[PDB]
Design a protein around this ligand. Structure first.
Ligand code: SF4
Ligand code: SF4
Ligand SMILES: [Zn+2]
Ligand SMILES: [Zn+2]
Ligand SMILES: [Zn+2]
Ligand SMILES: [Zn+2]
Lengths: 294, 294
């Protein structure tokens, strides 16, 4: 029975030994989010915040909640140029913002830099997710800083932090990443939430999100870790949360942004990519890579 | 191809990127065992050692190797009184010692204490494995000390240590446990070995072991952890070993053996068991529990 009203429970959280009807689950989820924000001084009451929005359940849900709590939540979507996948992601995301009258910023990777994640992978030599991850972190930050956002929110959740933690133990982040001179802050307001929890909010709130996952991968290390931890969690609710809980610079020559070297990894990657595009005659020889500067 | 001779490989160890024919796998396993013994000063050349032998693959294999290396390896088996299971375990174990002319010590739990692990569980209030585990640790030690063994060896392996480590991270031991006044030392010479590795040695050496597992459990926490870690290991060989590696008193009033209280957990358990047997008229009222003393 629902713990708040005593009518039919629509969501059960064995992790928390808690059951709620639709309305009170939705109420709890939102309130629990505002709790994380306050417990870690993540945001200011109506603060502008740049939300990294993929079109997936977590980031749409997050965009949804932060609005509800009255923050000025601007979304940033990055069209990564991964085929129909990147196309659908953008569509969904745009559909979402359109319906809610939220403002959406979009960076199209091929229009801005000349190559989509696939060609970027082939040319940089990195695995697609390495190139892609690096490209996502850089551009979100740059967009943030360029547009005056003190802070940036991602929809990373309990499953993510625990999977990451587990990955490190096998192969040797905090709710708030502190603002620095060339770095906006990164808050994860869904850090305590289960994936199943976020998915529940998303379904009960009627949010249409992109069900398709990205073609690669499909061999993700993160996925392997999540299965193994879910296999445990199923039989031992609260395992992930216990696990987690238990445990707890220079300016780039090309672009001005923070790095521990002369040239940042991002500039270093697009530099080489451009160089090799030239050698293979894909770019004119007199073209160079000019990153936007701080 | 086998790394030592170049003929057909019979065992592959992706964990180690190593392949060996039967003869050279057997040679490697034995030599790797003698390595663990020396690297951690576990044993002396012909030292007497009490081997906890269940009749399973690990302890028979271990009993086999320690003999081969010329240690005086006496086995200890505990008939725990768990139905046909405890019966078969004893048979297998006896068959093994008989064929190799090794000496086997046996403690039958019902003959010594009056109850088998099942009744022991019901009467102590503990889950069978809690009563059983406590009973096994106590009796092995007592037998060791009573018989003048400085040291005791168990067949616990990499899978076991990693499963245990994982269990603690979710729900908050060393190769050598140091001899103390009332405690013989405990060496695990198979601590670096995979389960699959030990099983391989066992099969290639032609050792007949007890394939049946114990009726409870069948819900083991240790089992859950091992699956989840194997699920990872399959896709990422060396995960367990990385995981592991990365990370790295008073006398009892009744019985004289070490404890952190007045009466040790073992004496405390059999005491209550006897008391409740009396109340239920299963023991005469004038009978008391007299544990053997140091
Ligand atoms: S999966 Fe790899 S490639 Fe596909 S989006 Fe996430 S990171 Fe970029
Ligand atoms: S499983 Fe539980 S009960 Fe069966 S033997 Fe191992 S410990 Fe004793
Ligand atoms: Zn309710
Ligand atoms: Zn740079
Ligand atoms: Zn060989
Ligand atoms: Zn005692």
């Amino acid at each position: 029975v629902c713990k708040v009203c005593g009518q039919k429970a629509q969501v059960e959280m064995r992790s928390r030994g808690l059951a709620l009807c639709r309305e009170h689950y939705l109420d709890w989820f939102v309130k629990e989010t505002e709790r994380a924000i306050r417990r870690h001084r993540m945001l200011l009451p109506g603060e502008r915040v740049l939300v990294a929005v993929s079109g997936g359940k977590d980031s749409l849900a997050l965009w949804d909640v932060l609005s509800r709590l009255g923050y000025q939540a601007v979304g940033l979507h990055i069209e990564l140029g991964i085929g129909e996948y990147s196309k659908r992601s953008l569509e969904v995301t745009q559909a979402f913002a359109r319906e809610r009258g939220l403002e959406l910023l979009v960076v199209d990777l091929k229009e801005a830099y000349g190559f989509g994640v696939p060609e970027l992978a082939r040319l940089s030599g990195r695995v697609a997710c390495s190139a892609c991850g690096l490209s996502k972190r850089y551009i979100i930050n740059q967009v943030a800083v360029e547009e005056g956002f003190r802070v940036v929110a991602t929809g990373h959740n309990l499953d993510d932090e625990a999977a990451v933690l587990f990955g490190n133990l096998l192969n040797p982040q905090g709710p708030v990443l502190p603002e620095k001179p060339g770095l906006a802050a990164r808050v994860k307001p869904f850090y305590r939430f289960s994936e199943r929890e976020v998915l529940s909010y998303t379904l009960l709130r009627g949010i249409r999100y992109l069900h398709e996952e990205c073609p690669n991968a499909k061999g993700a290390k993160s996925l392997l870790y999540k299965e193994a931890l879910n296999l445990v969690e199923r039989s031992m609710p609260g395992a992930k949360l216990r696990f987690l809980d238990g445990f707890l610079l220079r300016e780039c020559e090309r672009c001005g942004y923070p790095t521990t070297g002369a040239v940042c990894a991002f500039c270093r990657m697009w530099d080489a990519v451009y160089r090799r595009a030239k050698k293979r005659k894909l770019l004119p020889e007199e073209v160079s890579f000019r990153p936007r500067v701080k």
